[PDB]
Ligand binder design. Structure first.
Ligand SMILES: [Ca+2]
Ligand SMILES: [Ca+2]
Ligand SMILES: [Ca+2]
Ligand SMILES: [Ca+2]
Lengths: 1051, 341
C-alpha cells in the first residue's frame, strides 16, 4: 500500500519581478511540479477586463472566447503573465483559465495597496492570492483550509478529491496530521472510495449536493475518529500529495448522535432526588464537573459519564449542590487551533451565573425564594388567542437604560435596572401607565438575556453620571487623549459633555470624540451579543452575583403585567454568538462542541460573520434543540408572552415552526415574529423570510410601509437622506430644496402605504398609481412583491425602531424649510397614524410619543446614555446634543448642518402635544373591532380605499372598513362602517366620496378638541368632509338598531 | 417486481413563447422539480455578450461581475430569460450562471437557423440546447454519460449504483433504452447484486479497482446482450429513477472472446485453397463481404459465418478473388450514436 509523500522539489523564488506600470501573476502548477515531465502551458490564459471597481488594466481583451492572453513565460513551478498596466494604483480583475474554463472559482481582484511588489502568486481552485511563489507552494503542499465535509457516518464530501487516484481519511488522536522529516504521511488512515451523494444528504445539505462523494470503509470506528483530528488527503498514483485539508464534521455529529442526544435534558437539572449535570460534547476526550465555593475555590472535581449513543456526558450529585458554582473542564480537539484544548467552560444551558458570567450556578427556577409575591398566579393582561386578539397588539420597543437612566423620579440605585419598573411614582413608570391606558398593549424588551458587551463588575465600569476622574481610572485611553486635562477637574462626565456642546460643530465633533471613549467602559449596549441565552443580563440587576437577577427580572415582569397592565415581548438573538474559537472569553458553544454550533465557510471552515459577529447554525439539530429549550424557560419560568427573532432570515423556516409548535404546548397563545429579510442562506435551506412565512402564523416586520412613510430606505447616506422624502416628510406635496421625486414616484409610495394599512396582503386587490386593479403581490417593492402575507397578523408595521434614524431625525432630514415645528409635530403623528390605524400589527420605538431624537445617530448601539436619552421630565427630545458617531455618520455631517438649525428644538409644550396625539391614535385603534380584523379574508371582504388611481390627490389616504350587510356579520354593534382619512399635505382637502352618507367624527377625537389631530375637520350635513392640513380623522358610520348596508368593497 | 419510472411531475410545456426581435432561454431546474419547497432564482444570471461570430444580441452587459441579468420570470420547472435581440437572424453567446460561476461547462451558441421558434431550453452541466422544456426534461430524467463498466462476463463496475436499492442492467437489441409515454422503463433488464472487485479485475483495470462492483445473474446471456444497447439503471425503493448511464463493454469483450479470437488470422488471407476473409466484430449483428470490380461495381455480397467463441466472422472464396476490391458491410450498434449503424 502506497505511502503519501511530499514532492522532492525546492521552494520557488518568483523567477520574475514586477517592474513599473506592469503586474506579474504566477500560476503555481501543482500538477506541473508533481511531474518530472515538461508541461504545455498554451491552454492557460487570463480573462482580463476593466470595470467600475478594478480599472487599472491596459488594453484588456473584450472577447471571452479570446484564449490569446497565453503565458508571458514559464518554468518548473508553472507559468506567469506579465500584465501591462495603466496606473500603478488601484486594482485589476483576473480570471485564471485553461481554455474557456475558470481555474480559480472566485473572480480575483488584485489590490496593489495589499501587495506592494505587484509580484503575486495563485494556485488552481484556491481563490487566495500570495505575495510569493514560496507562500503559495507551502500552502499547496500543506494541510490547508477545511474543504472536506464528513456529512454522515459513511459519507465524506470533497471536491478536491474528485477523480484523484488516492483519496484517504488520515487521523491522529493526540497530534496533528503532518509530513515527517522524510516528507511522508505516516499517520493512520482510511481508504475512501467514490460514491454518490445520498437522497437524505442532498436534502440536509443542498449547498454541497454538487460536491464529490466518498464512501468510508465499513470497519471505520466513527466514534474514536471524532475524538481527535481528521484530514482528507488526495494523492497521485505514486503517492505524491496533491491536497491535504481539514474536515468539517457537524454533519456526521448530527447523523451519529443527534437522534439519542435530542431525547435528553441539559444543564444542571436540580430536581427531587438530586441534581443531574448534563453536557453534550460528542468529540470531547474528557469532561469533568468542577464545583466551586462562593469564593470560587474548588470544592469538588467529578469526571463525567459518557453515553456512547448520544455523546452526552453526565454526573449526578446531591440536592446540597443547590446554589453551587460550576464549570465543565473540557479536554477536546479544536480544529481552529488544531490542538487538544484543555479549558473550563460555563454551561450553554446555564440558568443562573456569577458576576460577568464567569461561572455557571446550580439553580431551581421553581423556588419561591426566586419569585415575587403571587408570581404563580400571574396572567397575560391582553389576550393573544385569536387573529383578532393578535391584531390588537400595539408594541412599545423599550431598553432598560433608555427607560430609567435619566429619570430623576426613579431612586438612584434603581436607575438602569429591571427594578426601575417598580418606581410607581416616577415620570417614566407613570408615562407607561398612561400609554397602557390609552392603548399600548405590549412592551418589547431589547436584549435582557445574558449579553457579553457590558462588564458586570461595578468597579471596571464608569458612567456619565459619575466624576470624570472615575472615567480615567477605568479607561486607560482617556488619560492619553484630548480630554486628559479633565481627570483633574471635579466635574462629572455628564457635565464635561454639556460643556463640549458649546463648541461642537461638523468641523469640531468633540462631543462624539469623548463619547466614543466613554462607550468602551459604560453600562450601555443594546445587547445583541449573546453570552448565555437562558440567563437574564446581570448588569440590569442590583447585584449580578448569583440568583438576585432572577427574582429582580420576574419582579419587573409582574410590574409590567399587573401594575402597568401590558404583555411582554422578549427580543431574542439566536442568529449569532458573541464569539467562537478556543480562546475568546465569550466563546462558550464553540469551546464545547467546536465547529458544530457555528455556521462555517464551505472552503475555509472560518466562522461566517454575515450577521456581524459569529454566525450560529440553527440548521443543526442540537442548536435547534438549544433554541427550543431556551424559549421554554423564558415561556414558563419567566412568563414571556411573545418573542422577536433578530435576523430571523438566518434561521430555517422549519426550525422556527418546530420551535413554535414546541413552545405552544407550554403557552398556546404565544406569538413569534422577527426580521425576515433575505439572509442569503437559501443555498443551505428554506429561510424564515417574509415571503416564505405566508400563512405560517409567524409574523415578520414589513419594510414596505416603513420606507414609504419614512422616505428612502436604510443605507441612504449624504444628500439622499434629504432628497428621498416620504408621505410624512411631504414627498410631492411640500418638497424640500434637494427633492426631485416624480408624481408617479410619489403615487407609488401611496400604493405601498395603502397596501400596508390593509395588512400588506399578497392577495388584496387594489387600484394602483396608474388606475390598474392589482393584487398586493403584484405591487412592486424594489423588485420584490410588495404584499406577501396571508393574514394581517403575519405583518408588523412600523416607522421607528432602535436601529436606524429616529422618526423625528428622519423628518428633520426630509422636511421642507417651510415646515415649522408645529407642522413637523403633526408630520410625526401623521407618519405614526399609518401604523396605528392599519390592519397590521402596530409596532413603535419607545420615545416616538416624545418626538425622540438621537441627534442624527444612525446605529446608536454604543452611543451610550448621551445619544439614546429619553427625557421623561419632558424638557426636550434630545435633538442637537452633538455631532453623531464619525465612524458611521461622518458621511452625513454636511446634510446634518444644512438641516439641524432649520427648525427649533421641541420643548415641554411640543412633547405634551405629541403625547396627546399618540394617545389619541392608540385610543382610536382600540375603539373598534373594525381596525383589527385579524383574518386576511375579513380584510378583503371589508377593507377598500378611495382617492386611488392615476388622478389621485397626493398625501390623501382614505380607507373604508365595512360592517354592512354585504360584508357578513355585524362586528361593531355601534357602527355600520369606518373611514380613516389621513391628509399628509400642506393644503386642506375635501371628501365628497361619502355623498349623503351620515357620518360623525370619533367621540375619542371630539373629546380631544383643539388638541385633536382632527381639530378643524368639517362634516357637512350633506356628507361632505373638509380635512385640514396635516390631519387625521376617523369618520364613523353609526348603526341604527339593525345592520344596514355600510361601505361595501368593489371590483 | 418494481417498475422503474420517472418522477411524478407532468412534462413541461415552455410556459413562455419567444416573440419578434427577442429570444427565450429556459433553465430546466432538476433540483427545483425534485420539489419540496419553492426556489430562489435570484443567484441565477446569464453572462450575455456580442462577438465577431454571435452578434445578434441587443445591449449586452460588459461587466463579468454583473449578476444583474437575473431571470425574467420562473415556475416549478425553473427560471427563464426573455433576451432582447438586434436581428432575428444569426446567433447569440449565452453563459448560464449561478453567481459568477458557469452552470453549463461550454459557452453556448444559440443558432436561430437551428431553432426556428427562438424558444430554447438548457440543463445545468448539459452543454446541449433543446427546442422544448419537454425534450430537456426527458433528457434530464434519462440516460446520460457512460459511467458503468462491463469488465468481465459476471461483473459490472459503477460508482453511481453504489448503496442504491435498485441496480439493474436494462437492454434493447434494436432500440435505445428509454422511458415510454407514461415515463416507465419497460425494456428487458437483469437484476444486479452488490459484490466485490475480483483479484483478476483489479489487475486488469487498476484505474477502476475503487469502483462499486455488481454481480450479473447466472442466467445472463452475455453474447446476445453485447448485440445491442445496455444501460445501467439506479432507482429508489419505489422505482423512481436516480441514474441511467451507458455501459463501456471493452473489458467483457476481452474476457468473453479474446482468448479464442487471439488464436485466429485476420484480413483477406489469400493462401492455397482460396481466400479466407476474417474480421473480429463480437458485437456486430451482421457482417457481409462486399466484392467490387475495378470500376467499383458490386460483383458479390456474401454474408459471413460467425464463430460464437471468438466473435470473429469469416467467409471463404476462390483464389480467383486475387486483386478484387472489398469492404465489410456492418450492422452494428455504436454507443456514440446509440444506434444500430
Ligand atoms: Ca452579562
Ligand atoms: Ca458599552
Ligand atoms: Ca454561504
Ligand atoms: Ca355593524
Amino acid at each position: 500500500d502506497v505511502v503519501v509523500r511530499l514532492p522532492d522539489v525546492a521552494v520557488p523564488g518568483e523567477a520574475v519581478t514586477a517592474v513599473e506600470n506592469q503586474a506579474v501573476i504566477h500560476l503555481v502548477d501543482i500538477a506541473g511540479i508533481t511531474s518530472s515531465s515538461a508541461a504545455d502551458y498554451s491552454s492557460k490564459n487570463l480573462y482580463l477586463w476593466n470595470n467600475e471597481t478594478c480599472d487599472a488594466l491596459s488594453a484588456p481583451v473584450a472577447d471571452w472566447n479570446d484564449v490569446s492572453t497565453t503565458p508571458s513565460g514559464s518554468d518548473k513551478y508553472g507559468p506567469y503573465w506579465v500584465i501591462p498596466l495603466n496606473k500603478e494604483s488601484g486594482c485589476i480583475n483576473v480570471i485564471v483559465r485553461d481554455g474557456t474554463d475558470k481555474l480559480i472559482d472566485s473572480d480575483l481582484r488584485v489590490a496593489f495597496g495589499d501587495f506592494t511588489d505587484r509580484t503575486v502568486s495563485v494556485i488552481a481552485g484556491n481563490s487566495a492570492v500570495y505575495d510569493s511563489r514560496a507562500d503559495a507552494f507551502r500552502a499547496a503542499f500543506g494541510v490547508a483550509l477545511a474543504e472536506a465535509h464528513w456529512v454522515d457516518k459513511n459519507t465524506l464530501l470533497w471536491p478536491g478529491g474528485q477523480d484523484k487516484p488516492i483519496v484517504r481519511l488520515y487521523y491522529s488522536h493526540s497530534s496533528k496530521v503532518a509530513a515527517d522529516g522524510e516528507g511522508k504521511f505516516t499517520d493512520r488512515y482510511l481508504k475512501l472510495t467514490p460514491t454518490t451523494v445520498s437522497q437524505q444528504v442532498s436534502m440536509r445539505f443542498p449547498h454541497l449536493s454538487s460536491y464529490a462523494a466518498f464512501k468510508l470503509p465499513d470497519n471505520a470506528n466513527v466514534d474514536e475518529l471524532l475524538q481527535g483530528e481528521t484530514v482528507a488527503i488526495a494523492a497521485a498514483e505514486d503517492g505524491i500529495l496533491i491536497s491535504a485539508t481539514q474536515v468539517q464534521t457537524a454533519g456526521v455529529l448530527d447523523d451519529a448522535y443527534a437522534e439519542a442526544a435530542e431525547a435528553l435534558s441539559y444543564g444542571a437539572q436540580l430536581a427531587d432526588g438530586g441534581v443531574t449535570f448534563r453536557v453534550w460534547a460528542p468529540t470531547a476526550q474528557q469532561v469533568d464537573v468542577v464545583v466551586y465555593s462562593a469564593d470560587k475555590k474548588v470544592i469538588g472535581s467529578h469526571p463525567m459519564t459518557r453515553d456512547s449513543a448520544s455523546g452526552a456526558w453526565s454526573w449526578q450529585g446531591g440536592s446540597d449542590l443547590k446554589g453551587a458554582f460550576y464549570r465543565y473542564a473540557m479536554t477536546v480537539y479544536h480544529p481552529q487551533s488544531r490542538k487538544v484544548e484543555q479549558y473550563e467552560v460555563t454551561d450553554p444551558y446555564a440558568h443562573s451565573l456569577s458576576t460577568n458570567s464567569e461561572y455557571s450556578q446550580v439553580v431551581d427556577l421553581n423556588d419561591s425564594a426566586l419569585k415575587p409575591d403571587g408570581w404563580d398566579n400571574l396572567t397575560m393582561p391582553h389576550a393573544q388567542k385569536t387573529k383578532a386578539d393578535l391584531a390588537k397588539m400595539t408594541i412599545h420597543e423599550s431598553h432598560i437604560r433608555d427607560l430609567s437612566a435619566w429619570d430623576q423620579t426613579v431612586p438612584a440605585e434603581l436607575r438602569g435596572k429591571y427594578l426601575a419598573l417598580t418606581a410607581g411614582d416616577s415620570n417614566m413608570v407613570q408615562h407607561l401607565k398612561t400609554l397602557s391606558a390609552s392603548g399600548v398593549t405590549h412592551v418589547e424588551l431589547l436584549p435582557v438575556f445574558d449579553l457579553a458587551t457590558v462588564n458586570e463588575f461595578s468597579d471596571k465600569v464608569a458612567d456619565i453620571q459619575q466624576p470624570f476622574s472615575r472615567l480615567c481610572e477605568v479607561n486607560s485611553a482617556v488619560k492619553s487623549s484630548e480630554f486628559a486635562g479633565y481627570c483633574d477637574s471635579g466635574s462629572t462626565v455628564e457635565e464635561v459633555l454639556n460643556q463640549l456642546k458649546q463648541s461642537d460643530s461638523q468641523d469640531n465633533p468633540q462631543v462624539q470624540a469623548l463619547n466614543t471613549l466613554v462607550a468602551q467602559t459604560d453600562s450601555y449596549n443594546w445587547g445583541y451579543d449573546p453570552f448565555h441565552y437562558t440567563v437574564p443580563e446581570g448588569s440590569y440587576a442590583t447585584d449580578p452575583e448569583g440568583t438576585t437577577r432572577i427574582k429582580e427580572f420576574r419582579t419587573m415582569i409582574q410590574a409590567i403585567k399587573q401594575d402597568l397592565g401590558m404583555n411582554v415581548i422578549m427580543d431574542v438573538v439566536y442568529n449569532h454568538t458573541n464569539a467562537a474559537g478556543p480562546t475568546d472569553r465569550t466563546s462558550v458553544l464553540d469551546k464545547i462542541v467546536p465547529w458544530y454550533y457555528q455556521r462555517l465557510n464551505e472552503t475555509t471552515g472560518s466562522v461566517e460573520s454575515a450577521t456581524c459577529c459569529s454566525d450560529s447554525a440553527p440548521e443543526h439539530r442540537m442548536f435547534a434543540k438549544l433554541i427550543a429549550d431556551s424559549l421554554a424557560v423564558w415561556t414558563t419560568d419567566y412568563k414571556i408572552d411573545g418573542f422577536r427573532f433578530d435576523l430571523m432570515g438566518y434561521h430555517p423556516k422549519a426550525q422556527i415552526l418546530s420551535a413554535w409548535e414546541r413552545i405552544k404546548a407550554l403557552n398556546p397563545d404565544i406569538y413569534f415574529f422577527g426580521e425576515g429579510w433575505d439572509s442569503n442562506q437559501s443555498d443551505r435551506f428554506e429561510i424564515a423570510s417574509q415571503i416564505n412565512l405566508k400563512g405560517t402564523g409567524i409574523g415578520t416586520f414589513s419594510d414596505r410601509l416603513r420606507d414609504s412613510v419614512r422616505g428612502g430606505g436604510p443605507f441612504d447616506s449624504g444628500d439622499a437622506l434629504r432628497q428621498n422624502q416620504g408621505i410624512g416628510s411631504g414627498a410631492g406635496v411640500l418638497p424640500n430644496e434637494l427633492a426631485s421625486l416624480s408624481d408617479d414616484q410619489v403615487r407609488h409610495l401611496a400604493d405601498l402605504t395603502r397596501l400596508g394599512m390593509a395588512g400588506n396582503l399578497a392577495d388584496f386587490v387594489m387600484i394602483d398609481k396608474d388606475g390598474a386593479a392589482k393584487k398586493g403581490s403584484e405591487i412592486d417593492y424594489n423588485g420584490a412583491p410588495g404584499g406577501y402575507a396571508a393574514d394581517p397578523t403575519e405583518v408588523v408595521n412600523y416607522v421607528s425602531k432602535h436601529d436606524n434614524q429616529t422618526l423625528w431625525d428622519m423628518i428633520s432630514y426630509k422636511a421642507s424649510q417651510e415646515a415649522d415645528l408645529a407642522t413637523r409635530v403633526r408630520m410625526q403623528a401623521v407618519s405614526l397614524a399609518t401604523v396605528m390605524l392599519g390592519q397590521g400589527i402596530a409596532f413603535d420605538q419607545q420615545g416616538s410619543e416624545l418626538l425622540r431624537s438621537k441627534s442624527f445617530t444612525r446605529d446608536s448601539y454604543d452611543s451610550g446614555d448621551w445619544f439614546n436619552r429619553v427625557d421623561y421630565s419632558l424638557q426636550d427630545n434630545n435633538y442637537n446634543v452633538g455631532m453623531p458617531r464619525i465612524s458611521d455618520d461622518g458621511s452625513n455631517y454636511e446634510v446634518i448642518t444644512r438641516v439641524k438649525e432649520m427648525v427649533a428644538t421641541p420643548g415641554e409644550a411640543e412633547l405634551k402635544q405629541m403625547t396627546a396625539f399618540y394617545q389619541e391614535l392608540t385610543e382610536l385603534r382600540k375603539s373598534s373591532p373594525l381596525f383589527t380584523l385579524g383574518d386576511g379574508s375579513a380584510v378583503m371582504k371589508r377593507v377598500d380605499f378611495r382617492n386611488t388611481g392615476s388622478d389621485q390627490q397626493a398625501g390623501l389616504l382614505v380607507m373604508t372598513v365595512d360592517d354592512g350587510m354585504k360584508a357578513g356579520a355585524s362586528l361593531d354593534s355601534r357602527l355600520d362602517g369606518l373611514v380613516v382619512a389621513i391628509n399628509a399635505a400642506p393644503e386642506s382637502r375635501t371628501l365628497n366620496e361619502f355623498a349623503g352618507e351620515t357620518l360623525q367624527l370619533s367621540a375619542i377625537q371630539q373629546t380631544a378638541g383643539e388638541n385633536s389631530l382632527a381639530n378643524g375637520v368639517q362634516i357637512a350635513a350633506d356628507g361632505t368632509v373638509t380635512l385640514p392640513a396635516w390631519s387625521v380623522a376617523v369618520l364613523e358610520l353609526p348603526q341604527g338598531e339593525a345592520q344596514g348596508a355600510g361601505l361595501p368593497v368593489s371590483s
